[PDB]
Each structure stands twice: as C-alpha cells, then as structure tokens.
Amino acid sequence: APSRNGMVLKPHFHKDWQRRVATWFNQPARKIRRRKARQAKARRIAPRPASGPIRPIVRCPTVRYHTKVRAGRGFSLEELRVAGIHKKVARTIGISVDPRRRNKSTESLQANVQRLKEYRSKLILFPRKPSAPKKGDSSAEELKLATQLTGPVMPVRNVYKKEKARVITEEEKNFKAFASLRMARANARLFGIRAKRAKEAAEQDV
Amino acid sequence: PSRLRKTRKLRGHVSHGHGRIGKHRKHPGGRGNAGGLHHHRINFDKYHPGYFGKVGMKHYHLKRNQSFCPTVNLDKLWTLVSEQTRVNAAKNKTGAAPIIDVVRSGYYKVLGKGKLPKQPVIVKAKFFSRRAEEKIKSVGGACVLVA
Amino acid sequence: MKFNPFVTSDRSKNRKRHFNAPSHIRRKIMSSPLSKELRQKYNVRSMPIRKDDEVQVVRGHYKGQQIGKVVQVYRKKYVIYIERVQREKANGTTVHVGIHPSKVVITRLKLDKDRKKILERKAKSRQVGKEKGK
RNA sequence: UCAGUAACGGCGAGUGAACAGGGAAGAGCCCAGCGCCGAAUCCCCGCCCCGCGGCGGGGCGCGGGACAUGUGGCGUACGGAAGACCCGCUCCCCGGCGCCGCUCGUGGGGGGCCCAAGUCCUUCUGAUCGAGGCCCAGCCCGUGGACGGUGUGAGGCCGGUAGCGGCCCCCGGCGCGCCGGGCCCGGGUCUUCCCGGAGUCGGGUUGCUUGGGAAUGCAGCCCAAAGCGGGUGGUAAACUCCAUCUAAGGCUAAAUACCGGCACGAGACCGAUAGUCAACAAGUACCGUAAGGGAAAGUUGAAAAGAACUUUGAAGAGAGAGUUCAAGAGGGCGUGAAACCGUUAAGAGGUAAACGGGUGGGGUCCGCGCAGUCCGCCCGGAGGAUUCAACCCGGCGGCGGGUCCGGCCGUGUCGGCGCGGCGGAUCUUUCCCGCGGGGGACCGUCCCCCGACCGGCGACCGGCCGCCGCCGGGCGCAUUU
RNA sequence: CCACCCGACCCGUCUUGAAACACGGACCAAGGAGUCUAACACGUGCGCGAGUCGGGGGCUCGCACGAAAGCCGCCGUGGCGCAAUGAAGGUGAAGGCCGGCGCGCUCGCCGGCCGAGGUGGGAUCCCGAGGCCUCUCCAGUCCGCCGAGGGCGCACCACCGGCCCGUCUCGCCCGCCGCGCCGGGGAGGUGGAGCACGAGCGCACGUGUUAGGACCCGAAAGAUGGUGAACUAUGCCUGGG
RNA sequence: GGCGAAAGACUAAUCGAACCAUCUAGUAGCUGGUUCCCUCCGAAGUUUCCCUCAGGAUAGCUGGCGCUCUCGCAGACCCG
RNA sequence: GCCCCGCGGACGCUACGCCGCGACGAGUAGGAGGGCCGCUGCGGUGAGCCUUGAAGCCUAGGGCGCGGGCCCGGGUGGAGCCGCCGCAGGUGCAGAUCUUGGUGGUAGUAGCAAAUAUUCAAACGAGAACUUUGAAGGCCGAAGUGGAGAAGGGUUCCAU
Ligand SMILES: [K+]
Ligand SMILES: [K+]
Ligand SMILES: [K+]
Ligand SMILES: [K+]
Ligand SMILES: [K+]
Ligand SMILES: [K+]
Ligand SMILES: [K+]
Ligand SMILES: [Mg+2]
Ligand SMILES: [Mg+2]
Ligand SMILES: [Mg+2]
Ligand SMILES: [Mg+2]
Ligand SMILES: [Mg+2]
Ligand SMILES: [Mg+2]
Ligand SMILES: [Mg+2]
Ligand SMILES: [Mg+2]
Ligand SMILES: [Mg+2]
Ligand SMILES: [Mg+2]
Ligand SMILES: [Mg+2]
Ligand SMILES: [Mg+2]
Ligand SMILES: [Mg+2]
Ligand SMILES: [Mg+2]
Ligand SMILES: [Mg+2]
Ligand SMILES: [Mg+2]
Ligand SMILES: [Mg+2]
Ligand SMILES: [Mg+2]
Ligand SMILES: [Mg+2]
Ligand SMILES: [Mg+2]
Ligand SMILES: [Mg+2]
Ligand SMILES: [Mg+2]
Ligand SMILES: [Mg+2]
Ligand SMILES: [Mg+2]
Ligand SMILES: [Mg+2]
Ligand SMILES: [Mg+2]
Ligand SMILES: [Mg+2]
Ligand SMILES: [Mg+2]
Ligand SMILES: [Mg+2]
Ligand SMILES: [Mg+2]
Ligand SMILES: [Mg+2]
Ligand SMILES: [Mg+2]
Ligand SMILES: [Mg+2]
Ligand SMILES: [Mg+2]
Ligand SMILES: [Mg+2]
Ligand SMILES: [Mg+2]
Ligand SMILES: [Mg+2]
Ligand SMILES: [Mg+2]
Ligand SMILES: [Mg+2]
Ligand SMILES: [Mg+2]
Ligand SMILES: [Mg+2]
Ligand SMILES: [Mg+2]
Ligand SMILES: [Mg+2]
Ligand SMILES: [Mg+2]
Ligand SMILES: [Mg+2]
Ligand SMILES: [Mg+2]
Ligand SMILES: [Mg+2]
Ligand SMILES: [Mg+2]
Ligand SMILES: [Mg+2]
Ligand SMILES: [Mg+2]
Ligand SMILES: [Mg+2]
Ligand SMILES: [Mg+2]
Ligand SMILES: [Mg+2]
Ligand SMILES: [Mg+2]
Ligand SMILES: [Mg+2]
Ligand SMILES: [Mg+2]
Ligand SMILES: [Mg+2]
Ligand SMILES: [Mg+2]
Ligand SMILES: [Mg+2]
Ligand SMILES: [Mg+2]
Ligand SMILES: [Mg+2]
Ligand SMILES: [Mg+2]
Ligand SMILES: [Mg+2]
Ligand SMILES: [Mg+2]
Ligand SMILES: [Mg+2]
Ligand SMILES: [Mg+2]
C-alpha cells in the first residue's frame, strides 16, 4: 500500500530468490588462490613475461569509445606478414595471433607492424640447445639482461598530440560551424529524395 | 544497532504501535502496487501523474553508445586546459590563441551557458550549439569541427 | 604464539585428541621429568614413564622423598601405580592410588635396548639445537 | 558495469536481456569433401630378441582378417596443392642412463622419531597451576608467553608451540648425463590447378518458449532450395547498394560452480526445552499393513577412598561406625529455584480470601545506643624537644630581561646555492637518432643552502643576570618555634 | 504477623459500553512474537566537494590476530552529480548601460565598459546629527554606551522581467562547396519534473514505505509423486458348513 | 480412481474424493497474542474515491525535527 | 606612596558543569526524549574481584532509587566473575483454548457390581480369604469352562 509521496518501486523478489543467493565470503580466498596461481605460472614460464604474449593496439568500436585504444586479442595475419613473421612461429616467441581480425585502414596496420618490429628488437631468444646457438640472442645478452618482464608487455597507452597555440586566420573566424552541421544533416537526410527528383526530371526532359 | 530502535521501547505496550482497533494485519489493501486504478487511485493520481498509459514510439535494440554525446558548457570550457595555458595566452604578445580539444577532455558537444573571458581560443568539438559558436566568435575565437 | 595453520588451537579439538588418543600416543603423553642427576647424566629432560622405573612423588598428598617403583602404567586412565603409594579400603584391602606421571620424577630408569636408543636420540637433538642457538 | 535499462505486459500486477567499456583467464585446432601417393593403413594370432607387475619397441611368418561401399600420409576456409627459380638448414620426440641442479614457493609431497627454560625458598590448600621472594635492568627460556593435560588459576611438570630445526623412510616433476630407440627439411616469389557438410537451409502453419515486440529459440506436420550462393544486418514487403560472416561434421586446458564425500582450519554463533532429529547403545526406542513418522535421555568425587564391622528387620529399610575438604557429594549422586507437601515456632480466624491509605500492638533483627559533639583559634597551668625569626652555603623551581647572549621561529624583499626534487593541455628547425621519443629553456611548487634584513620567543630552548619561593646543611640555644 | 477505621468487584481483550450471565486464564518453571536482505524517501552525524566513490581487480616473499589492514591513479572502466526538453528527427540555458549610426521596428549592425536583472520585505553589517560624564572654566586627545536618520543588503519569501526546449499565431530579413521541398534568425502567447555563479557524492544512524515466511500462531482448499482391498465393496479360483 | 441389489454406501476406527511425503512457514480485508521504567505531547470514528460497507487510498485530527524572525536591560550594587 | 604591624583571605566551573527566577503537571490509540534500568557476547580499560571462597540460590538482616532496578550483611555453594568507555544482538512476558516439563484442589473421592459359590482342615512359609494337598458343596454339561489343530504370536513351552 502506498503512503503519501513515494517512488513506485518494483522489487524483483517474487521468485524463490533465497534459494539462489551468491555470497562473497570466499572473495579473500579467491584472491589468494588467483595470486598463488599467477606466481606459480610465472615461476614455471620464467624468464618469459608474466602477463603473457604481446597484444596489438586496437581502437574501441562505437562512437562512445573510438577516441581510445586498448590491447587487442592478437596481431592480424597482415600485420605479421608485413613484419615478416611466420604465423606459426609468432606463438612460440610470445606474439599473440588473431586470424579473424582484418585491417580496414593502413594507420592501424602500421601501428601494429611497428609494435611487432620494436618487440622483436627487445626479444632475447635463448638457443634450444644451450651449448649450440643458431640465430639466438648473444650469450652476453642472455646472461645478464634476461629477466621476467612483469606487467603487460609494452602497455598500450592513449597518446595525445600537443597542439601549440597559433594565430587564428580570417577563414577560421568566418567558418560557420553550426550552419555547416545543420546543412550537412539536411544534405544527408534529403540526398535520396533529391536523387529521385533529379533523376525523375531527367527522363521527363529527355 | 538494535539497541537504538523503537522495538526496545515498545516492549510492554501490547499492540507494538500498530493500534488496538486497526491492528497490524497481513496485507490490508493488497500487495505491491495493487489497486493503482481502483482503491489506490488517488495516491497514484496525486504523486504519480502519467503512470498509466502508453506514450511515444518504441525502439527495439536501443544501443545507448550510439547516442553518446556528453556536453560541456562555455562557462566551464576553460577548465579543460591548465591554468598556465590560459594566462600565458592572455599576456601573449602576438594574437596566438590556445587550442582546446573538448574531445580529448571527453566531451563531444559544446553548449553555450555562461560567458567567456575576453581572449581568443580555438575550440575543437564534434558539435557546437548556435549560441556557443556565437559567443566563441564574439571573444575572437574560432570553432573547429572534428570527427 | 602458534603459527602452523595445520595445527589446531581449538579447546574442544585438543581435549578430544587427548582423551581419545591411542595407547602409543598416550605413552608420549605420559612423560615424566628425569631427576637432576639423570638429566645431567643423559642430557635428557623427560622420558615416557615405564613399569619398573623408580620415581618420587613430588606433588599431592603422597609427596615425599621416598623412592618407589612403578608397578602399573594404566594408560586408559592416564595414571600410574607406585609400590608404596597405596591406601586402605574400608574392608581392609590395600589399593594403589593413581598418580599422574607428570607429578613424579624418575630417579632410576629401566634401561634396555629401546630406552638407550630413545635417550641417545633426545640428547643428540638437544645438543643439535645448541648448534642452532649458538 | 551496462540496468531494473531497450523491450515484454488484462501496457495491469508484474517481467526484462544484449552490445560496447574495465577486469579474471587466455590456446588453439581436427576431419569429410576436393586431389595425389602401387592400401603407402588398421586389428588379431604365432615365434624370437630387448627394456619388461602387459606397457610395449623391433624382427620374422608363400599367418588370418578389416579395407577400393575407401584405411593412412599430405591438406580444411587463417586458403591448399604441384612445378619452376631464390634463400636458410639439420631437427623434434618418447622410454630406461646416472649424478642428483631444484621455497617446486614459505621452503616438492607422504609417514615416523626427536629437539629451551623452576616443580628453587617461604607460605596458602583436600590438592594446588595461588601469594610473596629469587643482588646488581638478571630466577630462568623466549625465533618457543598458542593450546591441552596434570587434585586451582602453569611460558619454564608433561604433550606440545617457535625454528630456510635435526634424523630416518617412501613417492613425484624438473636439471644435465649414453642410449632402447624412433622421427626429420623449412621459408619466399612466380605460373598453373583445386576448393567445402541437404528432407538441411529456407517458406507456411501449429504448439511451447523468449525482453525479442507483423513471430527470440525449439519442435511437429506440409512445402522444399541455391552456388557471384547462403545466413545475418531487432518493423511485415519489393527494388538497390553496402557491411559482415560461411550453417546444416568434430575436439580442446584456464579463469567458473559445488548444502554429497574424504581430510583440515576458524568463529563478536548455540550452550542440553539451546545448537543438527540426534553432546548419551539416535534415525535408536517406539508407532503404523505400508509409504512413512520418530523421541526422551549430559554432570558423585581430586581419587572409589562406592560406606569394613556391630545391631533391628523376612526384606525393602534404619541406627551406630567409617571414607572424604565435603555424603549438608551415597551410585539418574555438582548446584538444587518455584509451584505443591510434611513438620516446627509465632500470630489470627462467624460476613471467601486477598488489596490501598492510616495508625496501634506484638515479634524479629539492627544501631549495640546504653552517658554519647568534635574541629579551628585564643587564654591559663603543667611538661618536653631534631627549636623560631634573621643571616650564610649549596640544589631546584617559578617569573622577567629578545634594544641579556646563543639556539631558533614567523613572514617578506634581493642576489644566489644544490643539473636540487616534483608537476605543467608553456616553448623548443640548440641539438640526437628512429616519420616520435629524448635532451634543453620557461612557469608553478616544494626542499636545501646562502649574505643583508625581518616581528616574536607558553613554537620549542639552553647559558647568564635579577627577583621571589621551596628544600637540604650551617649559625641561631630560648619572653622564640 | 495481627488488630481496627476509611477506601476497595478480576485481570488480559474486542467494544459506544466489561465486575459482567462476553471470551482466554487451575498452579509454577523454562521457551515465546516488528527480524534480516534488497530498494526507496526524508531527517540527523562524518569525510571530501563540482565533484565524489573503488564496492570489482591487482600489488605488498598470503595466512596467530590478518578472511584484517595498507596501497593503486594511464586501475575511475563505471555509478551518481555537474542540462534540460521533445513521441521523435533534434535542439539546448546572459544580459544591462555608453556611444556611432541605420530602420521604425519598437528594433537592427558596430567599438566600449560592466558582468546572473529589477521591486517590497529582510538576520547581520556600515555611517551617524544629537546625547551621557569626570572638583570647576578655556579649547584638545585617548575613549565606551545611548542614538534619530541614512546606507550596503545574506538566506529566504512574494511579485515583475529575462534565458533553454516543445507547441501555436504572426511577419520580414540573412547565409552559401551544397540555390535547396536547404539552413539560420525575430516578435507575441502557451506546455516542461529546465536556467538564472552549482551541491553533490560516499559512509553511518534513525523513522516510514514496500517485495520477500516478513511481528507470531491459525483455515476450508490447490498441486506433484508415491503407499494401501489384513477392514469393507464386488468378480473369479479352491475348500468347509 | 475402484467398487456399489444404490445408502453418496464401502475403499485398514479416515470418504460428497483414502492415506503418506513434498510444494509449504500456501493465502487470510478475519480471531487471538505481542515481553522494562520514568518524562513530555496527544487523537480519530468525519471528507472524497474504490465490486467499497469487518478493508483501503485520500484530506482532516497527532507527534517528531527544525528553521525564519520579533521581543532584552541605563549598571558589580541600587538605581526608570 | 598601593599595598603591608599582619604576606593572608571559604566554596566554586564533570561549561554535556553549576546557579537564579516564573509558569505549569489528566490521558487510550499513537509519537518522541532520558534511563548511573536490565540480559548476552566483542574491542579497550579498571597494576579490577576471586579457593582467606566466583557464579547461582535462600533470607522476619541493613539500606538506596518516583521507578525500572541496585548495593551491602548472613546462610548455602565450590570456579569463575564484574565496573567504566565504545561495539553487537536470537535482549526483558501474565495472558496467545501459547510450547515443553513439573505440580495441586477435586480425593483417599468415583470406582475395583455382566456370566449362581464357596467352606473345613493340614502343609510350606517371616507372612495365607487368594499357593499346594485332602475333604465337602457347586458349575461347564459333549453346539463344553473338555480333547486337538489352521492363521497369528515367537519361547509365551519345561524345570529350578
Ligand atoms: K506506529
Ligand atoms: K516450423
Ligand atoms: K513450611
Ligand atoms: K477479545
Ligand atoms: K472468562
Ligand atoms: K516486513
Ligand atoms: K495355530
Ligand atoms: Mg592475466
Ligand atoms: Mg501507550
Ligand atoms: Mg491487538
Ligand atoms: Mg489499519
Ligand atoms: Mg566448537
Ligand atoms: Mg542507473
Ligand atoms: Mg511475446
Ligand atoms: Mg519469466
Ligand atoms: Mg562486453
Ligand atoms: Mg582420405
Ligand atoms: Mg618441554
Ligand atoms: Mg590448566
Ligand atoms: Mg599451560
Ligand atoms: Mg613464573
Ligand atoms: Mg614445528
Ligand atoms: Mg551476403
Ligand atoms: Mg537492407
Ligand atoms: Mg580432434
Ligand atoms: Mg540445564
Ligand atoms: Mg536437543
Ligand atoms: Mg530433539
Ligand atoms: Mg561442599
Ligand atoms: Mg563424615
Ligand atoms: Mg549442602
Ligand atoms: Mg556437593
Ligand atoms: Mg543434588
Ligand atoms: Mg493496609
Ligand atoms: Mg605546544
Ligand atoms: Mg456489542
Ligand atoms: Mg475488562
Ligand atoms: Mg448480566
Ligand atoms: Mg471470540
Ligand atoms: Mg477457561
Ligand atoms: Mg522467561
Ligand atoms: Mg544525508
Ligand atoms: Mg577515491
Ligand atoms: Mg583468521
Ligand atoms: Mg583489501
Ligand atoms: Mg566520475
Ligand atoms: Mg568515463
Ligand atoms: Mg532584494
Ligand atoms: Mg527558412
Ligand atoms: Mg517559447
Ligand atoms: Mg515515506
Ligand atoms: Mg499454515
Ligand atoms: Mg483453485
Ligand atoms: Mg480380503
Ligand atoms: Mg450389495
Ligand atoms: Mg441423499
Ligand atoms: Mg490407509
Ligand atoms: Mg507466519
Ligand atoms: Mg473485510
Ligand atoms: Mg470498479
Ligand atoms: Mg455494511
Ligand atoms: Mg472485529
Ligand atoms: Mg502527563
Ligand atoms: Mg547501609
Ligand atoms: Mg546471540
Ligand atoms: Mg526473542
Ligand atoms: Mg509464564
Ligand atoms: Mg499482556
Ligand atoms: Mg468409596
Ligand atoms: Mg462398587
Ligand atoms: Mg446353565
Ligand atoms: Mg449342570
Ligand atoms: Mg444344548
């Protein structure tokens, strides 16, 4: 029964909710268990990076997030092809590969191609046989530099280009931003009915 | 804290604040929002005008990411840049104006509430209000559109 | 303070394990201090009490300097009977009175192959801990 | 998180996802088909040799069978194959070597056995784990003062506890070490060839389902495909463009769930009408034909020392005696409430009892009263003294002196220090290189230092001086205290 | 404990009305009923504040306490708040004086200044003629209180005006890569949970409201799956009287 | 469901729908109960709407929390 | 000259404290405040209490508080317990034909009355209306109160 002024509420408690209640008393225990597994995995895979293989830069979709980049699932086959890395070899040396991803633009492709090349320079490759090295990193390089890289490999950061202050030209001062948007919307809205009418008069005249 | 509740003060009063006549029964009046158009009509009409009925066009599979367009007014527009940038421009010898990219700050549209300090500025946004563009022009600035 | 997560501090648990311990564990529970001369001789502080061990009662109504022989180790009752530690029942029968082994001091040990092996284990370990403390 | 949202809904009550984003984890693949390779493939059996609890490896057999109605190698939508030309090569794996590298993460795992220090002195007590003491900071150990037991209440009596503590035994992965062995090419470019899952998709209709709304998914029935095709693109339909994937075959760890089970730890939980029904010979006794239902019920004592013996009685049961700190603990025995009863003492009693107010009488017990104000000052008598004021010598303290001196502090201006630190949506064709990161300048801030200079010292602070007060010592030796 | 005088009916409950010929209650012990979770509202306390908040994750050689605590900042993703309005496409909160003009709308272009309008009330604050007085007179200084009267007016209230969005009536003017079935502007009304120099966020406590067993005890019923013809009803078989 | 020479009879002391367990602590505008003390304030049985008349929503009546202001003085004493 | 024959002059002010003046005081349902009212457990604290006697329980003992309640003495008991500052709640009973356990008045009452019936003597025995033996009087009356079985019971059979 409502009483005086209040919000109309519809609590979703008409089923046997008490039978399905997930408590979180094992949350501290879960965090401990995940931590120990991370540490155990890192010791097992040393000196390979603890977080995992390197991931590519990808741009988040939709208008809400296209201004930001993040780590992708894996490098595309085109990116690996340009970088000169066989897709089968990439996984063994710590490069994630995503055959599903396609590069729509060349800016994204070059960003990840550069990321792969810069990763390859940073990579220290131990010989399969310690006594015999063929094309692996130098003994000196392996002996000292090799250490387990903690945290994401080459974290993906949103870079912002600084734009220095400048004198406003006459053209910029005369640019009508509001009217440009208003007409651009109408041009897109009426483009078809204009193509229909313009076409319709064409056979009318001819 | 149970020691601070009325329950402790109601021990020994018989009806526990619920009355001898009306009592505290299970659900006199129905459960939930029962009777909104009947015995509870007055409450619903008085505190919730508009509750019953259909209004407008329904849209299946609404993706709120598509309509994402956060706005920043003109009065708070200069907060998007460091105070060093604002003062250095005001005392700048040549008419060089700083470039403010509201998309970098996380805004897409510039609205025109308030007034601007009298100094040129290049504002970059996805969308501009009419008054917002007018006021930027009045102080000698420029509006630049981005995608 | 105890730090082992696999060792319990529960009062109910420790009492349960104590009062339901099997006999061989009850042997360890029924340890008694050695006398000063024995402690100095073997470098051992305590031994599990055995029948045919001479002991002194150092606590209770029968406390004194008399050296008596342990005639029965009743592990099920956690008590030992000593040869002169007795009392007079109503009908005249003489019954031993049970004394907890932690309240007696061994003055002479019944040495055989097993006790000598046990004693040299405790003394080797006590000495090894000195190689720790140092 | 989106989100109680889009949506569903007698658009009522109510119901209700997803995508993007941030995380945990992260791993990819195999067939059929299409082809090419002399079926190049598999199972079983017999024998021998070697590792060898049957796990097998190989060799043999004019041994058997499966299989062309299709086994295996290559290959699967990320394309693939062959040929030519170029480039780069000798790998990978499994089982027994030995020695044993190895926080494997709290020291691989499992089991066993051990490891500090008071029962000192005095006392309390039935017993003590109580109390007091144990020079010099010292009873002693402490990487151990968790817990339990022991006649209270114990770091030091005992088990234990702590410890990258010890020893022994067993088990497993890794690390290098001959072999029993198998297995062994790859990438690029060009030309040419090859390329896909059907009573399935899809359509109608029915029923269920869903937030899915002119139908989200599923199924039945009917219809029934295509190959520049097919599916999807959240409003039915036609045309058109575009986007996006490739259904109708299959495998796959992790992050996730876990009121059963095997072990284990813990708790601001319950404390025998509580907590599980069940602290106990509890799913027991008992009930019901049966499915099924289903209790009540813990405590002597430190130790049985569980009351010898005498005596009355047929005995149950008593009276003595005895054990014990206690039977005023005697075997359903810690404590032992109320209701109710017996007895004893006192009081009362014909308006049922009981009750409020007021007094009176009696009784119980208390004050234990039963000679019952002390405190301060002054006066008088009668004693005694470490004797008072004042002054001197030490020590301490309080207050004052920042125009007493250090120390310092508050703030401000100038120059300047540490390339000082940090930040900055300031600038950088000084300059460096791979088209951006560096490195610089500037600004802000902080921190340090350095001269002048700066108001003030309960912000903190010493020395010095002045005053006052106290204390200890000296003198003061009696009209004083 | 008893005596006497005055008073004095049995409580709980429902009820207009209970000492009732209304119901429950023989007696005593122990147990016994507004809870907890989610949501929401307001009020109060605390922190920070146009922001606020790590709750999910991670880091700290996990682990008596510690399943705690601390930290993150290119972990603030995200929530709520800072912007409303419209069904939606969408649009989206600043004006007043000083001039120089044009136009005659009562407006429009330019430079300036200022910077969230105005009116009535308004805690507080500011100024203040005049006063009060010392042993007396001459004029002064430090220096409080009284003070008519005036001024700046917080918050808040009311009223007028203004700004944004929807909608309507009206009427002209302007823009250009789109000369368009294009885009923008004015004025007068009216609809809005708007603006008009932010007040929120997190945490805690209380009270109320609700969904939940929902203060406790209580139906007649409904559903699913099972057990029964040892009684009894009826058929059959095989016996007995 | 059975079975009924029919009484809604009988179907294990149960029959106008057996018994057992579960759903299920089923719902109840209805009946009963609802546990310490003192202090201060203190009602309503009326309005309107409701398949409403033993119930609610609504306004009234209540309490709690405030907040916005108004009203001080000749005086340590006494004294306009 | 401010001080000085005298070197001194009560209490206060847990400011959430203390003090003064005036008016007021009914109360169901209900609301609010205070509680140095009460229960259980947790963090602190009381160099707290306790085998020279804790909790509990009893009390014609002594008192305090309007009250909720509390303190102390005595007795019993035999191992634990409490104050204060905060925290937390399964926190206070007279009722619910409440739940479980216990106990009364009724009350030494109703009752121990269906089917004809017992008596004498002896034995054993602590003890005889009731057992056993003997004698007598009776009944069942062969459709039995007789002798054997089925089902069901499950040791009830027999001896001591
Ligand atoms: K109430
Ligand atoms: K179909
Ligand atoms: K009595
Ligand atoms: K009633
Ligand atoms: K009655
Ligand atoms: K509730
Ligand atoms: K028979
Ligand atoms: Mg990870
Ligand atoms: Mg009341
Ligand atoms: Mg009631
Ligand atoms: Mg009511
Ligand atoms: Mg336990
Ligand atoms: Mg939300
Ligand atoms: Mg639907
Ligand atoms: Mg549903
Ligand atoms: Mg997602
Ligand atoms: Mg094939
Ligand atoms: Mg030891
Ligand atoms: Mg102990
Ligand atoms: Mg101990
Ligand atoms: Mg000690
Ligand atoms: Mg250990
Ligand atoms: Mg297509
Ligand atoms: Mg389309
Ligand atoms: Mg497979
Ligand atoms: Mg009990
Ligand atoms: Mg129980
Ligand atoms: Mg039970
Ligand atoms: Mg006793
Ligand atoms: Mg005795
Ligand atoms: Mg007694
Ligand atoms: Mg006793
Ligand atoms: Mg007893
Ligand atoms: Mg009276
Ligand atoms: Mg200070
Ligand atoms: Mg009536
Ligand atoms: Mg009454
Ligand atoms: Mg009557
Ligand atoms: Mg009734
Ligand atoms: Mg009755
Ligand atoms: Mg009770
Ligand atoms: Mg608040
Ligand atoms: Mg924060
Ligand atoms: Mg823990
Ligand atoms: Mg944490
Ligand atoms: Mg935020
Ligand atoms: Mg964000
Ligand atoms: Mg005003
Ligand atoms: Mg127009
Ligand atoms: Mg308008
Ligand atoms: Mg409310
Ligand atoms: Mg019920
Ligand atoms: Mg029905
Ligand atoms: Mg039959
Ligand atoms: Mg018949
Ligand atoms: Mg009939
Ligand atoms: Mg039945
Ligand atoms: Mg209920
Ligand atoms: Mg009704
Ligand atoms: Mg109606
Ligand atoms: Mg009526
Ligand atoms: Mg009624
Ligand atoms: Mg009153
Ligand atoms: Mg007293
Ligand atoms: Mg509790
Ligand atoms: Mg309760
Ligand atoms: Mg009761
Ligand atoms: Mg009551
Ligand atoms: Mg009689
Ligand atoms: Mg009779
Ligand atoms: Mg006859
Ligand atoms: Mg006859
Ligand atoms: Mg006859």
Short mmCIF file of N, CA, C and O (backbone and C1' of nucleotides) and ligand atoms in Angstrom, two decimals, chain F residues 40-41, chain G residues 25-27, ligand 63:
data_model
loop_
_atom_site.label_atom_id
_atom_site.label_comp_id
_atom_site.label_asym_id
_atom_site.label_seq_id
_atom_site.Cartn_x
_atom_site.Cartn_y
_atom_site.Cartn_z
P C F 40 5.58 14.85 32.84
"O5'" C F 40 5.48 15.47 31.38
"C5'" C F 40 6.22 16.65 31.03
"C4'" C F 40 6.39 16.75 29.54
"C3'" C F 40 5.12 16.70 28.71
"O3'" C F 40 4.32 17.88 28.76
"C1'" C F 40 6.76 15.32 27.71
P C F 41 2.71 17.79 28.63
"O5'" C F 41 2.47 17.57 27.07
"C5'" C F 41 2.94 18.52 26.13
"C4'" C F 41 2.77 18.02 24.72
"C3'" C F 41 1.39 17.51 24.35
"O3'" C F 41 0.46 18.53 24.08
"C1'" C F 41 3.00 15.98 23.60
P G G 25 -1.40 22.43 34.60
"O5'" G G 25 -0.66 21.04 34.55
"C5'" G G 25 0.07 20.62 33.40
"C4'" G G 25 0.69 19.26 33.59
"C3'" G G 25 -0.17 18.28 34.37
"O3'" G G 25 0.10 16.96 33.91
"C1'" G G 25 1.83 18.69 35.57
P A G 26 -0.82 16.31 32.76
"O5'" A G 26 -2.16 15.92 33.51
"C5'" A G 26 -2.15 14.98 34.58
"C4'" A G 26 -3.29 14.01 34.44
"C3'" A G 26 -3.14 12.98 33.33
"O3'" A G 26 -2.43 11.84 33.75
"C1'" A G 26 -5.26 14.03 33.17
P G G 27 -1.13 11.31 32.97
"O5'" G G 27 -1.74 10.47 31.76
"C5'" G G 27 -2.58 9.33 32.00
"C4'" G G 27 -3.55 9.14 30.87
"C3'" G G 27 -2.95 8.83 29.51
"O3'" G G 27 -2.82 7.42 29.45
"C1'" G G 27 -4.59 10.55 29.31
MG MG H 63 1.07 13.53 31.65
#
